Amino acid sequence: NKQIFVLYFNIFLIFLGIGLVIPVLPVYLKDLGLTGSDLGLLVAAFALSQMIISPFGGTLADKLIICIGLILFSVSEFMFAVGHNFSVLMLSRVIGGMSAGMVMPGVTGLIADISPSHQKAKNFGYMSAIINSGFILGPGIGGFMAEVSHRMPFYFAGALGILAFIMSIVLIHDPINWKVFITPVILTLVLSFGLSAFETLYSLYTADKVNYSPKDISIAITGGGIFGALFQIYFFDKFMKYFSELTFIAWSLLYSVVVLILLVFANDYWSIMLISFVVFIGFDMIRPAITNYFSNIAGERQGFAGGLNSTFTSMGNFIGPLIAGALFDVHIEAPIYMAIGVSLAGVVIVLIEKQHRAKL
């Protein structure tokens, strides 16, 4: 009961540390130069340092990974905060990607074995709700702290990191088949091809349609996060029914494409534009679904499965936004059809199960 509560704070810190850099970066984007290609490289640092290093966590996972990774996060983020020049920030984001791609398999694996055979409800619902809570509260916390001594937010998430060591070392205690991996590992990429390509561009699709000042869209998406959290807390009923393992993903994808289709024809900012935020609920029942699926293929050694998630979901989350930004200009509605396309691709790939279930 307390090990798991200590454990969530690591993941909360990782994604709050991704979210805390947004309201401080423009302060020294002008103090270092940092042209467009340099900023794209700074983004890709975290991507290709999370990519290959994450399966290695599952290579090593069979306690120790979480604590070394969290020291790595704190050191990484301090050295980001030092901020000499690009030669420092680039390697800082690389080692930070190392840390956040080593702790994420460590947590995503070790929850899957300490928790009892009801491992879905509290455990994975809150592990994929605290992720969104960190993404929300990143800029929200960073707003107050960036006003005073703009370096302060950074090592703030630095200082907490050291705290997140001690709780995770004294309040907690310790106690093959590449073919079967194929079904979700490609699957989790496909949605991450477009879902990311959706989310990244939601602040540009609904500023060229009905006008959204930055506060209104923030209200829309905070509401989406809250009313998606309040649905993935009672997630255990919905997964205990709906033919647990794999069927649920298909129904969520059909729901999402339906509400996207309804979204393409929505004017009227407050009535039928704001309220259609509920689309993201259909995209927030699937991340716990694939994480549980990964934890359920591998009987032991859940670290490998969590790592194989956290590498290719980051591959999708990196490939997608570039494509969506590139082909956004040829339309205004281009991001939506990417999400529709990948959702129907997901529907196609999940219904392959019946032929696969017909043989072993």
Epitope: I22, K30, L39, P139, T200, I217, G325, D329
Partner: antibody, heavy 132, light 107 residues
Framework: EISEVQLVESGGGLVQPGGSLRLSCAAS????????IHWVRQAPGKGLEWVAS????????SYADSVKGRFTISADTSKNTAYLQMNSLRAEDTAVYYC??????????????????????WGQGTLVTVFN | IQMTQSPSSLSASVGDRVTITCRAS??????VAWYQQKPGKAPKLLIY???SLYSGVPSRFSGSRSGTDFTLTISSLQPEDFATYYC?????????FGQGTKVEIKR
Amino acid sequence: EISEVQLVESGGGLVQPGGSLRLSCAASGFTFSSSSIHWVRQAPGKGLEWVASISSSSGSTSYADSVKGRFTISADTSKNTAYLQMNSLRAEDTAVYYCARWETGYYPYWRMYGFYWALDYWGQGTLVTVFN
Amino acid sequence: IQMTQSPSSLSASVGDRVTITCRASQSVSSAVAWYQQKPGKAPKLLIYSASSLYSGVPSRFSGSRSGTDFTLTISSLQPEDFATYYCQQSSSSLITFGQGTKVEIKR
């Protein structure tokens, strides 16, 4: 705000129509390897008008339609500068050619509103005078 | 492509509100900037991508997208805000400036 990027230009002066100037916008203080260079101009009295451009790496020399074909713009990353040819001069080309640099992007953050940035840097300009 | 900009002379006393509007010939994007040029110096950039203040710029220079009617709004003019204001369209690699708006003091 701690910035010292200075763009300088040199090479104006009196000409004859059909002459050949070649205007050096000697960049400084930045990684020329990945940036844009834009050449604007201002006739005496009127308002600004864009006449050439170049992307230093992985780009093509975009031009203005009214004065396309009489200029050959090229950027030499070796000596940290960028030049612009000057051929078949007409009386409509007396001007004050600034050398400018612009970028603009978006740093997105997961279905919130993240960023915008401009980076802005301009020059000083050389009076180019035409038919005498 | 053109970028019609109106009006071409403002005689506004110190501390009052002014509004300058550009009308793109085609709806391009949220990509418009709003330079200003002091007499005989270089243009500086004030607002980029149609809404975002530049660093080191007073908070009065509040821009506003409106359909294709990109606008710049100064709440109050001050003795350092009396110079020509240009608006630039950053289209697909065919840049075009505006016809030019002047701002002049009242006696």
